[PDB]
Paper text:
Drugging the hub protein 14-3-3 raises the challenge of selectivity, given that 14-3-3 binds several hundred phosphoprotein partners. Inspired by chemical crosslinking and reversible covalent fragment-based drug discovery, we developed an approach that we term “molecular locks” to rapidly access molecular glue-like tool compounds.
Halogen-substituted benzamide rings improved stabilization (5, 6, and 10), except for 9. The optimal combination proved to be a 3,5-substitution of the bromine and aldehyde functionalities. The DSF data corroborated the enhanced stabilization observed in the FA data, with molecular locks 5 and 10 eliciting 14-3-3γ melting temperature increases of 4.7 ± 0.2 and 6.0 ± 0.3 °C, respectively. High-resolution X-ray structures (<1.4 Å) were obtained for all molecular locks, except compound 9, in cocrystallization with the ERRγ phosphopeptide and 14-3-3σ (C38N). 14-3-3σ features a cysteine (Cys38) in the binding groove in proximity to 14-3-3 Lys122. The cysteine was mutated into an asparagine (C38N), as present in the other 14-3-3 isoforms, to avoid potential reactivity in the crystal structures. For all other molecular locks, a continuous density was observed for the entire compound, including both the covalent bonds with Lys122 of 14-3-3 and Cys180 of ERRγ. In addition to the dynamic covalent bonds, the compounds also make noncovalent interactions with both 14-3-3 and with ERRγ, responsible for the tripartite molecular complementarity between the molecular lock, ERRγ, and 14-3-3.
Author numbering:
A (entry chain B), D (entry chain B): 175 to 182
B (entry chain A), C (entry chain A): -4 to 231
The structure:
């Protein structure tokens, strides 16, 4: 599970 | 450059068409041409600029991670020597990624940031400056690495200071900035506790302000809050 | 051109890396350089060439279809006049797509086809020639359209004649060729009955030959048979 | 549902 950055 | 002969409004229209066609390289080229017309960008136009470049660099970064993992395996003990090709190709992708980051940083420096006076626009551009330095930092291995990291940190910190003073804690730009600065702390600055603290404080302050929002604004803010929660769950 | 200084084996290695990274434009450029070394391609190398270009053009075609649909709506009665931008951008994508098709056709003509003597390689390259003329036909609207369509038909027909004489009905190249020629009949040549007949006959002849195959060959052949069945279900 | 051609 890859961490979230500000993407759609 | 090549977009100098096209009307600003036509570049914006074509950027929107390129987005619909998932042609993000074209979309970025159209938005670069629009920025280079020299007029400030509207809220919608800033969104188009960021969407375009974040998709271009996002694809380059994903490719770089694939190639970096292959290269790292090739340097493990017992791995056969296969020549310079893996390194060469990773370097090729890396150089192209750095070029796009430098292009975005150049647009921000000439002259988007200096002309941005409203909190929303200034925070947005400073967030972008932090992000593209962060992407440079992801691939940096040399003597300027600390200065690249500090450039990202400084841009994020100025954006955070403005956003805290001038924008509500539920503002989507403020929330996306905090999400990205938290990722910076976690995986660039080797500061997981700072990353976790920032994500938690941002989430909780947004939660407390949801009661002020319309249904549509509530949906926008809670979407980004869920990204903060996703990271908190991953990291704790 | 730009790959002239790179070893053939390094171009192949980098094409495989580009595939793993989903960098299909790079993959196609590496395989073009490999073809231009002048030696014949192995089975694996032909697969890399086709995968690379079919992904590049596949993305261009999907974008072209998005833009064409927007343009068609703009020409409906009651649609506001929005200027030349939609047409211009569709034309830009179309010209880029045509350029890639011309590049592939040029590699086939200089000199892949003339050097291909084994049935597998010759059928593979003639299938590709039909496919890239078919992609040109998808966007053709002018006075050479009939000749583009006939060029696709002629290449497919020669590939079919060789494949029927020299290859078993379960051969994956024969099956993929028949699938694509059936699509050509359905949507390029306005011959749905020929498309349906070809798909059915190909499916049934492959079915009858499955008993001769190993488990692994059976899996390969039935995968393509399912594509034929998918089209028969859609078309009937 | 788009018809199939020879693709992965
Ligand atoms: C939902 N969302 C994306 C996930 S943060 C946003 O509102 C968004 C979009 C863009 Br462009 C920039 C920023 C800052 C925030
Ligand atoms: C499964 N499959 C793709 C769907 S036809 C194939 O065996 C294949 C692959 C390539 Br490259 C070329 C041809 C002809 C056939
Ligand atoms: Cl390279
Ligand atoms: Cl254009
Ligand atoms: Mg201003
Ligand atoms: Mg305010
Ligand atoms: Mg030969
Ligand atoms: Mg034979």
């Amino acid at each position: 599970r890859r961490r979230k950055s500000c993407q759609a | 450059g090549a977009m100098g002969s096209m009307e600003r409004a036509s570049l914006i229209q074509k950027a929107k068409l390129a987005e619909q066609a998932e042609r993000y390289e074209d979309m970025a080229a159209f938005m670069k041409g629009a920025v280079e017309k020299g007029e400030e960008l509207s809220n919608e136009e800033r969104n188009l600029l960021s969407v375009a470049y974040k998709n271009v660099v996002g694809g380059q970064r994903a490719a770089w991670r694939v190639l970096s993992s292959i290269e790292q395996k090739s340097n493990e003990e017992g791995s056969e020597e296969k020549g310079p090709e893996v390194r060469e190709y990773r370097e090729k992708v890396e150089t192209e990624l750095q070029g796009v980051c430098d292009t975005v940083l150049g647009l921000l420096d000439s002259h988007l940031i200096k002309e941005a006076g409203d909190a929303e626009s200034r925070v947005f551009y400073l967030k972008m400056k932090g992000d593209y330095y962060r992407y440079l930092a992801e691939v940096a291995t040399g003597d300027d690495k600390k200065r690249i990291i500090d450039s990202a940190r400084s841009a994020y910190q100025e954006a955070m200071d403005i956003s805290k003073k001038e924008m509500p804690p539920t503002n989507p730009i403020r929330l996306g900035l905090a999400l990205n600065f938290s990722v910076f702390h976690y995986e660039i600055a080797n500061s997981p506790e700072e990353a976790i603290s920032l994500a938690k404080t941002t989430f909780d302050e947004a939660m407390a302000d949801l009661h002020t929002l319309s249904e549509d604004s509530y949906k926008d803010s809670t979407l980004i809050m869920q990204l903060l929660r996703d990271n908190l769950t991953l990291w704790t």
